[PDB]
From Swiss-Prot:
Described function: Catalyzes C-C bond formation between the carbons ortho to the phenolic hydroxyl of cyclo(L-tyr-L-tyr) (cYY) producing mycocyclosin. Can also use cyclo(L-Tyr-L-Phe) (cYF), cyclo(L-Tyr-L-Trp) (cYW) and cyclo(L-Tyr-L-3,4-dihydroxyphenylalanine) (cY-DOPA) as substrate.
Binding-site list for substrate: 75, 83-84, 235, 299, 383
Gene: cyp121
Reactions this protein catalyses: cyclo(L-tyrosyl-L-tyrosyl) + 2 reduced [2Fe-2S]-[ferredoxin] + O2 + 2 H(+) = mycoclysin + 2 oxidized [2Fe-2S]-[ferredoxin] + 2 H2O
Name of the protein: Mycocyclosin synthase
Length: 394
């Protein structure tokens, strides 16, 4: 006798498990057990993943309902699971989007200057260098302080909440509440700080005093700052880190992008497609009985949309494990999701990775791992797959 298949399969972000293609072929929707002990439906084909993400009856908000089967414990208040819905209901979606575009004057130059400064410091210090802790994550942090309009010196402490805030735990996490409440207090102070007049927080600060937003809660305004900092920093830092591994393990591609940097955007789109940064499927709770492939999902059941299931599906992306810069459907991957909850920071995430990679290839054309790849230490029970350190030489 064996127990029901458990998720996630592996915390490693450098290889996709063979089990993914086996499930996709044999049972592209099948029952699994999550870390909390709940059962869920794991969806692993492109066709079924998109079906779920495109049907709002598979609800993100309802995953926070008391008594629901859970993928993991909440690390935020339950209402914050509906964060984007709350922002939209407050009439703030357009303003938040506009504030997080990479097209803001001087923003791309700031990303370039910051990436170049971080790389120059690594070169001065000498190999080995840690590309996660001393490149990708500080670049993500600096970017988000700039986008938010908050002091660069405040970034490191906000960043240190993230190793806990983005845990994927079976049980509630006491430290997550301590950090959440403290970070909310910080953002509430930013809204009242007369010096904060730029970026997302400067815009929220002004809208907060505009009569057309007088009944939007101060709780929501502070929550937008904490959540966009956290989601953006963890997602960009983690994606860039693991994309650097994907690139370092593909020296022919690395050489091609070094030689022809105009191919970097197409390269980043493929690095997004093959990315294993999301450690768990995207969760949704069924609000009705809905047929998904051979399974009638019942109201109240949990569904997990496995992004690498979709993104490595050979029926949608032939030769899925290969980075091919001339695919006919290059942006049709699910790295930023699909449907109602499509990533609001997608353009900024793409630009962060493009500039980070462009700068690294110019500064360190000979970049390579400084340890055998198996020696990377993959963070466990986390919402992202990331190596704890990424030691390189050049
Ligand atoms: C490479 C970088 C990024 C990746 C791969 C990524 C990926 C994703 C994915 C897959 C989703 C959909 C989740 C779902 O449907 O359950 C999402 C949602 C979200 N992301 Fe991103 N993200 C990235 C960057 C960012 C940035 C830069 C920000 C903000 C500054 C951001 C903010 C958010 C937020 C707030 C949501 C929730 C949207 C909703 O619920 O409607 N992301 N992201
Ligand atoms: O915008 C959001 N949208 C939802 C997206 C979501 C839903 C369910 C999950 O299992 C994971 C993420 C959750 N809260 C935020 C993301 C977030 C989470 C934790 C933090 O400490 C900071 C920012």
């Amino acid at each position: 006798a064996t127990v029901l298949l458990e998720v996630p399969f592996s915390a490693r972000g450098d290889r996709i498990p063979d089990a993914v293609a086996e499930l996709r072929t044999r049972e592209p929707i099948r029952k699994v057990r999550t870390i909390t002990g709940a059962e869920a439906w794991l969806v692993s084909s492109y066709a079924l993943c998109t079906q779920v993400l495109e049907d709002r009856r598979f609800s993100m908000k309802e995953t926070a309902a008391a008594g629901a089967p859970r993928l993991n414990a909440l690390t935020v208040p339950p209402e914050v699971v509906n964060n984007m819905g709350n922002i939209a209901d407050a009439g703030l979606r357009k303003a938040v989007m506009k504030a997080i575009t990479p097209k803001a004057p001087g923003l791309e130059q700031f990303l370039r200057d910051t990436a170049n400064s971080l790389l120059d410091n690594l070169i001065t210090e000498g190999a080995p260098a840690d590309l996660r802790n001393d490149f990708a994550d500080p670049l993500a942090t600096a970017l988000h302080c700039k986008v938010l309009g908050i002091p660069q010196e405040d970034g490191p402490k906000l960043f240190r909440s993230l190793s806990i805030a983005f845990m994927s735990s079976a049980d509630p996490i006491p430290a997550a509440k301590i950090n959440w409440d403290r970070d909310i207090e910080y953002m509430a102070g930013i809204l009242e700080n007369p010096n904060i007049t730029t970026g997302l927080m400067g815009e929220l600060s002004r809208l907060r005093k505009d009569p057309a937003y007088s009944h939007v809660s101060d709780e929501l305004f502070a929550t937008i700052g904490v959540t966009f900092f956290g989601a953006g920093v963890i997602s960009t830092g983690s994606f860039l880190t693991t994309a650097l591994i994907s690139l370092i393990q593909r020296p022919q591609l690395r050489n091609l992008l070094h030689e022809k940097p105009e191919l970097i955007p197409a390269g980043v789109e493929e690095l997004l497609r093959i990315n294993l940064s999301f450690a768990d499927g995207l969760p949704r709770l069924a609000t009705a009985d809905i047929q998904v492939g051979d399974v009638l999902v019942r109201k109240g059941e949990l569904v997990l949309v496995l992004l690498e299931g979709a993104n490595f599906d050979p029926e949608h992306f032939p030769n899925p494990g290969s980075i091919e810069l001339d695919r006919p459907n290059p942006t049709s991957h699910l790295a930023f999701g699909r449907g109602q909850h499509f990533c609001p920071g997608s353009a900024l995430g793409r630009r962060h990775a493009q500039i980070g990679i462009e700068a690294l290839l110019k500064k360190m054309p000979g970049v390579d791992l400084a340890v055998p790849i198996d020696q990377l230490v993959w963070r466990t029970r986390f919402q992202r797959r990331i190596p704890e350190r990424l030691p390189v030489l050049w």
